[PDB]
Structure 1
Amino acid sequence: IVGGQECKDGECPWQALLINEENEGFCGGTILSEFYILTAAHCLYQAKRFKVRVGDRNTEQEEGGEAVHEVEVVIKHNRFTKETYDFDIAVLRLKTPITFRMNVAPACLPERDWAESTLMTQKTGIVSGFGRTHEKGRQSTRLKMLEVPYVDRNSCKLSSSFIITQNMFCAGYDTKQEDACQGDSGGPHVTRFKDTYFVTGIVSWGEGCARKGKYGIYTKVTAFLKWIDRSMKT
């Protein structure tokens, strides 16, 4: 995360960290229920086999509330293409159920029609992760959050040098130095309605980090809500 503020006690409880064999974090994730984790398909190329960390806010020291869960089924989207990052969605099934507490809680899966009419029409969204603080910098040891505003489709396409599909959406600033970076990928993008947070996007890609005239590209959850529900049965 470039700029923004850090996640406090109970602020970002839907955050999940994907760790390798050396406990090093490579990608973010979203908690949906006791057994399911939402992430990006490109994240399943960094390290394999991998594990899931929940209730983590600081990497350099263990905190009272951290838990390690192992993946049982890896439901990666078959239509994923590394050349454009289209269909960048993955659902993970865990062996043991998640216990919900102060730093561990899921995020609601909204209804397709209501999310397009009410959630997408909102002014801002919230992104979190253990990603880079600067474009060329190192990954943050502390969990950070950022308030990113929704960008219209026409302005999104005209700014990008790479193709923007129907499964993608723009969010962030035009000139201000506030955007998501490398390491935040696969992480959550939540939209607030009253006092409840709903899953709206997945941290995917972008032309650098916080670059002027460029925005952050996210995987549109609305186009995959029927696919997520089918994945939660098997």
Structure 2
Amino acid sequence: KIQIQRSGHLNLYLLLDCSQSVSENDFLIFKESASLMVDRIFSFEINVSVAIITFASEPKVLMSVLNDNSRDMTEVISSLENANYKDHENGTGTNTYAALNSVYLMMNNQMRLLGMETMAWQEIRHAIILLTDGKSNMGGSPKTAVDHIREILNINQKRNDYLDIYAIGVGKLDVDWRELNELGSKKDGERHAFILQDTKALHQVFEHMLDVSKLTDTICGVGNMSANASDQERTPWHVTIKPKSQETCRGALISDQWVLTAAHCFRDGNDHSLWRVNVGDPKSQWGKEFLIEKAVISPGFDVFAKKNQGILEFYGDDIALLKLAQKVKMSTHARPICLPCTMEANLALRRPQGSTCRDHENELLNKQSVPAHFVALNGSKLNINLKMGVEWTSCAEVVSQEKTMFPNLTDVREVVTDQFLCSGTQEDESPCKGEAGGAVFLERRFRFFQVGLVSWGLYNPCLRKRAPRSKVPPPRDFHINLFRMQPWLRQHLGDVLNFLPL
């Protein structure tokens, strides 16, 4: 399997079959799969050099790892889309041996450039992926070239991890299963030959094609993109907080020792020594229990602040801060989620250095209805839509229909200020009190960003079991906006995260 790690350098050599037996639309499917393939690797931000070659009767090196642009995402994707199905018009046969030999000539030139005994050639682990039907018919048996590339890298039991070869047929192709087995020789129990119909099945199999356990540099937003994986792996930042009140609230990891939650979940007081927080751990599904060094509550938070106006509960500044007893051991089940308007989020967004907080908010909240997610009690991921601007007023107009929490309400903005987001419209799920304090996060560039936290809502479905209703008041949820709380978050997290300028 491909070892995703910080140590060493990765080469991916993607070979594209352009034979006439493969139709033009199938080649387009290959290019789409290749696009997702190259996007996934570069999301881990490791040293990877990518070269693409197309072959029908002769190999065409559209990109070489010897060029420094092989480490650049934009140049690689541009060259990927530069590929044309008619580039092999003169020769329409199937010549896999020529492609493998081109890979060999490449490797020989690279080791000449860097050095035989130099570590720049030693550290590198090489992976080659074939997207072809496998029905080779001339040029010679590719297995001899497969053996040929082995001695140039000295492949034996002690260097098994340095070479990875895969032959997968994707699309509406008459795939020869026997041919893919020899090229994609099995190592240990891991398969190297697969037959798949579409790019999505290849997405899943390629999620199982990566060993991301090797590195621990633990950038945010690296969840898991497989339905096969556990819920905690999908949202590693999701943590569990139980105060003395015996109620369960949720939280999100943002660093190795910092936890974000809602202020309303600590009603007994500020005795943070009595609270316990559970974080996901690979060793057990119950997680690992930690103590809290210190707690910071929002000083502007007060549930009965507006009781003089008939407002029983006001969720203004419903945000709480916690310092864990010890640093959290980063793993697949325990990874932070980066706040916007931060340099870490800027790298996660692959954005230029000169970014501002308003620009990050624009990039995230770029649509009238922005889909979002929150974690339920069972760890499941649900989908909600964020409404801003003109529709933001529309989502909040339904609070005046309430009969219990606000017996005396006349002004809508007095309870739902600019700090509250919009969710619960149409078929959107409504988080309940047990899930309060959880992360409202967005997916972009295979990265997760927490834009808000669950504070309160107009409906309580939990009152594993969920059930909606169609009676006034309609379901509606409000999340504390993290973009509106930047000053205080920078006051307490300035030494933890390098916040970008406002």
TM-score with structure 1 setting the length? 0.81
Q: Does residue 15 of the first structure (1) align with residue 238 of the second (2)?
A: yes
Q: Does residue 215 of the first structure (1) align with residue 476 of the second (2)?
A: yes
| Partner SS, residue 442 of structure 2 | strand
Q: Does residue 52 of the first structure (1) align with residue 288 of the second (2)?
A: no
2:374 alignment partner AA:
V
Equivalent in the alignment of 2:381: 145
1:51 alignment partner AA:
R
Q: Distance in 2 between matches of 1:29 and 1:51?
A: 12
- Is 1:7–1:144's contact at 8 Å kept on the other side of the alignment? no
Structure with more helix by fraction: 2
Q: Distance in 1 between matches of 2:338 and 2:319?
A: 17
Q: Does residue 124 of the first structure (1) align with residue 124 of the second (2)?
A: no
2:456 alignment partner AA:
W
Q: Does residue 165 of the first structure (1) align with residue 410 of the second (2)?
A: no
Q: Distance in 1 between matches of 2:469 and 2:486?
A: 31
CA gap 1:7/1:227 in 2 versus in 1, 3 angstroms = farther
Quick one: which of 297, 300, 305 aligns to 1:76?
297
Q: Distance in 2 between matches of 1:202 and 1:71?
A: 20
Q: Distance in 2 between matches of 1:65 and 1:208?
A: 29
Structure with higher Rg: it is: 2
Per the TM alignment, residue 227 of structure 1 is displaced from its structure 2 partner at its CA by 1.5
Give structure 1 stretches of 5+ with no counterpart.
Answer: 131-141
CA gap 1:21/1:155 in 2 versus in 1, 3 angstroms = closer
- Is 2:265–2:437's contact at 8 Å kept on the other side of the alignment? yes
- Is 1:35–1:93's contact at 8 Å kept on the other side of the alignment? yes
| Partner SS, residue 231 of structure 2 | coil
1:146-186 Cα distance to aligned partner (Å, 9 max, x none): 11111231212212226211111112333x37221120011
2:280 alignment partner AA:
G
Quick one: which of 422, 428, 436 aligns to 1:185?
436
2:482 alignment partner AA:
V
- Is 1:40–1:186's contact at 8 Å kept on the other side of the alignment? yes
1:107-149 Cα distance to aligned partner (Å, 9 max, x none): 011113133201122520110132xxxxxxxxxxx32211111
1:99 alignment partner AA:
K
Q: Which has the higher contact order (CA 8 A, sep 6+)?
A: 1
Structure with more strand by fraction: 1
CA gap 1:173/1:156 in 2 versus in 1, 3 angstroms = closer
1:191-218 Cα distance to aligned partner (Å, 9 max, x none): 1122111110011001113554331110
| Partner SS, residue 168 of structure 1 | coil
| Count of aligned pairs | 213
1:170 alignment partner AA:
C
Q: Distance in 1 between matches of 2:248 and 2:324?
A: 18
Per the TM alignment, residue 64 of structure 1 is displaced from its structure 2 partner at its CA by 5.2
| Partner SS, residue 55 of structure 1 | strand
1:127 alignment partner AA:
F
2:299 alignment partner AA:
N
- Is 1:65–1:103's contact at 8 Å kept on the other side of the alignment? no
1:4-41 Cα distance to aligned partner (Å, 9 max, x none): x996351111111012469x651111101011100001
Root-mean-square deviation (CA, aligned residues, Å) is: 2.7
TM-score with structure 2 setting the length? 0.39
- Is 1:31–1:107's contact at 8 Å kept on the other side of the alignment? yes
CA gap 1:182/1:194 in 2 versus in 1, 3 angstroms = same
2:320 alignment partner AA:
A
CA gap 1:80/1:56 in 2 versus in 1, 3 angstroms = farther
Q: Distance in 2 between matches of 1:230 and 1:178?
A: 33
- Is 1:15–1:129's contact at 8 Å kept on the other side of the alignment? no
Identity of aligned residues (%): 24
Per the TM alignment, residue 103 of structure 1 is displaced from its structure 2 partner at its CA by 1.1
Q: Distance in 1 between matches of 2:433 and 2:240?
A: 14
